[PDB]
Design a protein around this nucleic acid. Structure first.
Length: 249
RNA sequence: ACCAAGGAGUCUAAGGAGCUUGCCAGUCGGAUGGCUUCCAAAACCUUGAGGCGUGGUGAAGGCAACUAUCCUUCCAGAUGGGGCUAGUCUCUGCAUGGAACGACCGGACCCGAAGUCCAGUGGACAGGGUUUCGAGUGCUUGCAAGGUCCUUGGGACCCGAAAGGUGGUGAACUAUACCGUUCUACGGUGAAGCCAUGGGAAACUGUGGUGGAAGCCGGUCGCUGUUCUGACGUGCAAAUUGUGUAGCCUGAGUGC
RNA sequence: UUGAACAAUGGAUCCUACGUGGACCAUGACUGGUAAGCAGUGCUGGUGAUGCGGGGUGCUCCGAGAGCAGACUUACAGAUCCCGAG
RNA sequence: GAGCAGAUCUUGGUUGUAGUAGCGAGUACUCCACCUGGAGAGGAGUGGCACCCCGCUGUGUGCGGUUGAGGACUGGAGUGGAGCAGGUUUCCACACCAAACAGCGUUGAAUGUGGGUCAACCGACCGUGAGCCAAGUGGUAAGUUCACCGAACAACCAAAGCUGCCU
RNA sequence: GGCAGGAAUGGCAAACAGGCAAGUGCGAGCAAGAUUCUACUGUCAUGGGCUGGUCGGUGGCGACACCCCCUCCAGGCAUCGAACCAGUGAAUCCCCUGUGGAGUUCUCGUUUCCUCCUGAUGCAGACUCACGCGGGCUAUCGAUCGGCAUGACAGAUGGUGGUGUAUGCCCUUCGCUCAGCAAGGCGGUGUGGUCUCACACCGAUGG
RNA sequence: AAGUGGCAGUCACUGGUUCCAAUGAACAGCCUGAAGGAUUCCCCUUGUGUCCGUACUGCAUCACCGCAGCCGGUCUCCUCGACUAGACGUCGCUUGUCCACGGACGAAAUGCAGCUAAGGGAAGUCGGCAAACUGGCCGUGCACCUUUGGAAGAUACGGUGGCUCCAGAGGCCAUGGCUCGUGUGGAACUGUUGCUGUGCAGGGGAAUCUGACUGUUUAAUUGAAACCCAGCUUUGUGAAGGGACCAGCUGGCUGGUUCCGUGAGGUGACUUCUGCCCAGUGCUCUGAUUGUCAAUGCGAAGAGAUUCAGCCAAGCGCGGGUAAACGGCGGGAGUAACUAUGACUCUCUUAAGGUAGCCAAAUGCCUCGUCAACCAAUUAUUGACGCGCAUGAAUGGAUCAACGAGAUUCCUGCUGUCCCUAGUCGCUGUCUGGUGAACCAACAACCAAGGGAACGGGCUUGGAUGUGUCAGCGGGGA
RNA sequence: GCUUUCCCCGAUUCAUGCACCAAGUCUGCAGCAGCUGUUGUGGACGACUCACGUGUCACAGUCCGAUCAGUCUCGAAACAUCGAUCAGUUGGGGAGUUUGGCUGGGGCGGCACGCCUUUUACAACACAACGAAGGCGUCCUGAAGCAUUGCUCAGGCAGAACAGAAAUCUCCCAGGGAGGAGAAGGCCAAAGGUGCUGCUGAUGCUGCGACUCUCAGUACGAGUCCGAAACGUGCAAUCGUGGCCUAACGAUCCUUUGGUCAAGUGUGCGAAUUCUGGAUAUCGAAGCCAGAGGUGUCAGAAAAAUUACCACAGGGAUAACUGGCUUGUGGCUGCCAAGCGUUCAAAGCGACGUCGCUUUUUGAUCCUUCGAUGUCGGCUCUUCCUAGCUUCCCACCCGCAGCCGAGUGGAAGAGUUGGAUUGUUCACCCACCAACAGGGAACGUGAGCUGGGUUUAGACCGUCGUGAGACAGGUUGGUUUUACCCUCCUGCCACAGA
RNA sequence: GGGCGUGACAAUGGCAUCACAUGGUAGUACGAGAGGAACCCUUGUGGCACUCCCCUGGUUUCCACCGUGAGUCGAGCGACU
């Protein structure tokens, strides 16, 4: 009868992010002449806590490309980065923690974060707490590069994508068990309206394909198709397998 | 409960079967046209196409009701005529009902297509037979108006659904998100950290304090609403109430 | 002897507007059932639609059928009194 | 649009019930005095008395308001003092309660009349927040409570109309 | 009009957030408004008119202190959660001594009750070693000297400079003294006519 | 010269300290600095301050909403004295008020409230429902079990007044003056043994089922074992992506995001485990090389409409994986040197044949199952046993500390729940002055029997019956 | 020690500092002092370039030489993306609708829904019930049809080598006891049987008749009777258009086939449906006629569940509660007398049989009630019955010595209890007692109470279902309102006037 | 003959004394024994009924007297909430 929770969320009325008191986008300084040809220096002016995020951010101040000015960019912090650090951004930057340099000046063992997925893009990969990617290999024939992502996947991105050298700060936070419901309450109160989460077997058949019945159960296989309409796409979406994972994944 | 007033088979298109009236192989013709202070948008007039009827039958191609003195036949039968007689004979034969047709019109069969003929591309009919059909004909039973009882579509005798649809309104209660902001006595208890100190070879450890954590406890405001299955239950109240009893009360708390 | 009796204001030909289409009761004619104020049937009559006299009372029994009155007489059935009639 | 006894019929007016059930949370009143047409109470109370006067007799535990004297309640998380939303003259005074209302009525938020609300300093106004509108552009058969609000963050975008000197 | 600058449309939206500046007599006098009127005493923002010689100057070792417009950039204030502990100040409240008035007094009670007050504002003052309330910084000295010390309820510090010392320097909450200001207020005691009301006098500016 | 009488709560500021997988706005406005540039030399609508709100009410017992002048609801601020831990509770100054329809009569019965009650003590009842017991503080002290935190205020024992003393802590001025523990311990005396003397103020213990907890919940019959939680585990996703809104959009959302992130499910703390089945359905992967398979396209024949063939997609078949996907997880007959039982064997058969565990459990029909405990008596309850109609493993199975207005059982104490009721009291009612409805109403209003739409007030046959009150009453008026 | 060859490179990395609006070089113009100094203001390089030189950095411009250029940046790229139009797939995410009927309530069950036979069924015809027993949706072509024709069947006595009970053969007997496909009934003997043989009459040319059963005197279906073409069989009469007879089946619309048409023959003639402005075309389509493809719910819609979240219109035409009829069942008594009883049928029983009564269990029914009669138990309170438990007649009788008792009669006055488990009625124990009898009163009694149970909405388990959901399976939690009217009853009072 | 009052009478209706037990009878009758009554007479008891308050209880707004707590009236006294 009635639509589903994950179908009313995408409508985005009271499921908008609680971002009012956040810091903005955390991205690498954009690509300009300095960052392409040589290197540019920036002072890590502050490390700050961003709401709804696990990693600390860093206000890093560079000079303006063509104006008498100081552009204060904001990027996810590298673990070990301190205030007043002098990070370096560009092609001729050195292989030091916090530096931002193209994915081609990096040897084939480098541990990187804030990784770009496209050229002139600004840091769309490996951005959560304790996240890091590992530069696997380079290909000069294409100017591209295989990198190992935190997910364990291996993505090929151009060797003009810029990363940041090191880990993302604030690591180890899933290694603490949330002990109370109130901890997760405060956790999600600054992210978005998604907690607590009623389970579909506890609803009525008007509200969810799982609701109703005299015993709380799903009467049909949970593994739903990928071509399933929005509204019966609840359960395990296009699951290749189910059950306990043992041996290889 | 009582009385008063209102209150339910109506109008319309088409039609059926009676009845009335007028005309008649016709009838009607108020679409429209001619006229003449209000009456008069009336009345009157036949310019009237046309409607219905005069022919039916076949899917159609199409075809289309014999009869030269008069008259289809038979049974019953209304009148009437001429003889005759209280015995009682002939002729007439309406209407109606039944039967028939050697009749005929159209359709369908069978054997044939012989025969006659010509507005002559070989065409038109024609003959004899049938367990044949027609909402057929056999001296056209029509038209129009009114009226009665009805039928069907319409609100359809009157009242009566739960429903379905189209467009709007509401977040003052209430649910939730965000922005700003408010509120949270008094105690109990005693986490980390810290101080002194006893023991020990050391690793470690005993004791007395300090400290003031916790979705900790009692408990006030407050919020909620267990129990009496209390009150009330024509209430204070369309959900409240007790000189009760309870739950929580630093939090996932609370309100604006 | 016009060839059985009795009866008979009747036979033929039509048209047409409605209501009804829950039935029930009674009887060796019965069927199912232990049976039922049960269920289902048959003939006929009743009730429904029907009042009146009697059965105290009773939709169905017995008598009889219903315009308004007068007189007489009766049906069923009645006469200790209630209550007409020993 | 033509006849009512009914349709839990419609509208109106009524009746019994019945002077009945009731008008029982928030502890509470009392005395004197004044205000009255009357309120320590009478219809010509009664005998003389021929209205005065002198006798006798009756009076409901007794309307309202306000001083004063007592008795009590609120008991600062108030029955106090201020303001929000809402109210919108209810504020104040006088007249007035024999029109009605206040489940009494010399009183009131009643009725009638007439008054009263003064800001450079208290606030709206100034912006900004969540959010919204126009604009720009787009979508629709078409208006729209059609889409975007994007100086963290948009576009398909010629939005700097302002400043210094000279003039 | 020329030159030189100048990405990024205009608004709305909070009577709780941001946001210039007022207090007392709560009265002269109101029946009813009052940080609005009134008497005093102030505060704020902003406009106009007038009157061969130019980087304001100086003091301090320092922390710092004093007197005499324009453009652009870098910062900061505005500016931000909650709870708990300690301190200081305010008003409230209470106590002691004394005064002025009142209540009780059958007996006792030098008793009982009220009052004895002080606002904004000031380019006023003394401290600020807060010698009342505490942080920061300065200079000198150079520690744990062999038992490290200082300061806190608890923290907390210290060769990245402790303790000690000093013209020490700064900011801030206050508090105190003065002006406001006693003339006002509060508790009273009287005079004068009376009136459609002014004068007189007294009573802690206590600890 | 120029803090300071006291100390309690509130407020302000100051110095800090803790909490966060939570870090707790923006703008206008204002200021400072850095670097440049440039540099003629008192008076005025008591200047301007314009515009709008400004009464009163406002947790209201009458100003708002609730039909109203409704015991309901409704935002914030200030907040005294005494007892006390106190913003509890009780009383009082300041402020405000005596207004709620009243009066008589000791005031029936019944009722709603407050209390008591001998002897017994749950025998009452579905059930200790309701009430009672206990209650503050100080000292001594405290068991099982445990997740080592708790349980715990366990359970329990003693004391508590009044007065007179004895000790006992600090500060200022200068070891004396003054202030100086309402904050503690001891003792003597004292009293009809009684003192948290009033208001206030836990009864306790022992188990089973269940949910871990805390939180949430059907406003107005269900507060729960339901939902949520943490934890666990699957799942899709590396962005031209996952999910997903919209009529549409070069549209908005998650996303100010980027795997320690996340969109979609399930289970439900810790602990100990989570067994077998991929045959069915589902999902997913392949080459989907063999089968089926659309539209368009290409070819042929036809005069043409049209007809016919072959090839090219996904899908479906085919093949593989997957159960913390949905789910599922067996019969028959013999057999041991007393009997009995059946370790053992035979056979059919499944995708697998229910594994470890647990049970007459909130799941067991039979069933009040059998044995034991409890009791005088036990359809209750507990411990066991187990062919379990129909238990069972994240449809989670089994233990389980702590917690619970959860469901059940036992013990103690306490009791009017009961034997078996009685008394007393306020407000009712009762009488009354003022005011004054509604429900309901065919008409009526005494029965028995009969018959009858089978249970009459009316009918028939009988029996009663004078009319009219007042307070009650629950048999009837189906 | 140069040259060239092109590849690589192009000033910033101890430090929370600063950094822009040009300095230098060269040079123009204007003013003043005289190519110079000064003042003022420009320009180029600094800071490479995007056919030539001249032209002002710009373009033009005239000549010269000769075959224009223009992308913000990176990637991808004629693929892909967002949509567009079709097509395949998927699609309870969503919508619309349906989810038969009968029925001793409905559901489950079944078919009494279209048919045939026997019976009910009651001697014309007719005759219902979820009455009784069955059958039907088929089967059969040198047949299981038609015809001629010959023969006689079931069974039995007797007989014949193997051979017997039962092989085959022979004789006699045999009314049908066989066969005719099947259910039952009827029918039939030189045969509506059967062998052999011959055949196809298994649609009597049509748009072809009258009828009968059914019945409305409709259809379909089935069947009877005819007319005449052409045939089979037979000497012939005849018989034969299916099955010996009674069952064996199907509308409109649509499709399909055959016919019509068209063609062909026609040894000369014809002999004809339409596609509409006139014609053609074995193009296509339409038409008429006869079949066939099926509606079994069989006079013929195209069709799944659930609701305890529920609703509406009704219904006492119809269930659940009371009551009514009946009492199978239950309960209570009778009669007889086989036996038991030491002998003895009755002191006490009473088998096999059999007559009754009650409502008091459960049935059966469906009569009243569905515009509602509050649905169990308990408590309270009253009354009634007797089918008599105690007490009384110290009754009578005994297998009665006493005691304890058994049975029977009169008698319904009084009594008939306290508890544990269970919601319980009941049951079962513990006791007390003279005894702890059985019942009724709308299964008395909810405006008397309670609310434990049944019986809403919440929730859990088990089994069932794919599911929502179901469950006489279990569990927990869950608002019981109103009297003041009339009467009865309780007390109270007056008037008695009518 | 009426009015008021008293004293009675009594139509009709209701109706209320049921049961048990100690002791004696009696260790008797009866009975081989074992065992083992009864009438009746006392005295009690139970259920029910009716009445009542001397005694003993229960109740206490006799707020009668007294103790005692918080607050308040200045304390006493006496009070009050």
């Amino acid at each position: 009868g009635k639509p589903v929770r994950g179908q009313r969320k995408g409508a985005g009325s009271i499921y908008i992010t609680h971002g009012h008191k956040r810091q903005g986008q955390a991205r690498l300084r954009p690509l300009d002449y300095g960052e392409r040809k040589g290197f540019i220096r920036g002072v890590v002016k502050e490390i700050v806590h961003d709401s709804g995020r696990g990693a600390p951010l860093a206000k890093v101040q560079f000079r303006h490309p063509y104006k008498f000015k100081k552009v204060t960019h904001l990027m996810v912090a590298c673990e070990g980065m301190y205030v007043g650090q002098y990070i370096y951004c560009g092609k001729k930057a050195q292989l030091a923690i916090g530096n931002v340099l193209p994915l081609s000046k990096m040897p084939e063992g480098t541990i990187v974060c804030n990784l770009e997925a496209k050229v002139a893009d600004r840091s769309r990969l490996a951005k959560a707490s304790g996240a890091y990617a590992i530069v696997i290999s380079h290909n000069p024939d294409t100017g591209k590069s295989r990198v190992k992502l935190p997910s364990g996947q291996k993505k090929t991105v151009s060797s003009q994508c810029r990363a940041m050298i090191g880990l993302i700060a604030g690591g180890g936070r899933i290694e603490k068990p949330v002990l109370k419901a109130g901890n997760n309450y405060y956790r999600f109160k600054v992210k978005r309206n998604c907690w607590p989460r009623v389970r579909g077997v506890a609803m009525s058949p008007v509200d969810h394909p799982h609701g109703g019945g005299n015993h709380q159960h799903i009467g049909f296989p949970c593994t739903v198709s990928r071509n399933a309409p929005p509204g019966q796409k609840v359960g395990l979406i296009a699951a290749r397998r189910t059950g306990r994972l043992r041996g290889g994944v």
